[PDB]
Amino acid sequence: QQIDLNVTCRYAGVFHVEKNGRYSISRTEAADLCQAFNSTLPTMDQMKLALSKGFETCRYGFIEGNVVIPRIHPNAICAANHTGVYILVTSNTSHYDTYCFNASAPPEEDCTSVTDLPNSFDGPVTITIVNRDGTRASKKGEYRTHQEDI
Numbered sequence: 001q002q003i004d005l006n007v008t009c010r011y012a013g014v015f016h017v018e019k020n021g022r023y024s025i026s027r028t029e030a031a032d033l034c035q036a037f038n039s040t041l042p043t044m045d046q047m048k049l050a051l052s053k054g055f056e057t058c059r060y061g062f063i064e065g066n067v068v069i070p071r072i073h074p075n076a077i078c079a080a081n082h083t084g085v086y087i088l089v090t091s092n093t094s095h096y097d098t099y100c101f102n103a104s105a106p107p108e109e110d111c112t113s114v115t116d117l118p119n120s121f122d123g124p125v126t127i128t129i130v131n132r133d134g135t136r137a138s139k140k141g142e143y144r145t146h147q148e149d150i
């Protein structure tokens with residue numbers, strides 16, 4: 001009963017979250033997960049400002065409307081040498097990572113550690129926030145509000 005949530009630096013309030021280091025989040029769960037961080041799924045605009053603040057990943061994730069990978073440096077194995085916000089057009093499958101957006105975040109680069117999931121509710125799961133620099137916060141809770149995701 002244990003979930004790792006892997007989080008990135010927030011850029012203009014937009015961060016990256018992987019569940020258990022693999023693509024295993026539905027669109028419904030993307031909403032619930034972000035809402036546990038007191039966040040909403042980003043709009044394209046919020047993501048485009050996130051990107052200009054110096055944000056990139058090598059992983060597909062949900063935003064408001066699409067599944068995307070933000071890209072600064074052209075790389076062959078990430079979104080296929082594309083730069084800017086790369087939109088996934090064709091895919092058989094539903095589960096990816098997610099992006100979230102906290103409006104309370106600093107306006108640019110925020111590479112401080114995330115030490116809480118301030119709005120998770122009561123549950124039996126161990127939920128471990130896992131940071132890029134390795135630091136951890138664990139709490140017993142739940143965030144999934146749709147049974148089809150549990």
Ligand SMILES: CCN1CCc2c(N)cccc2C1
Pocket residue numbers: 006007008016018021130131132
């Ligand atoms: C699998 C690549 N991801 C990269 C993202 C990430 C983060 N953000 C935090 C901890 C581990 C990881 C690993």
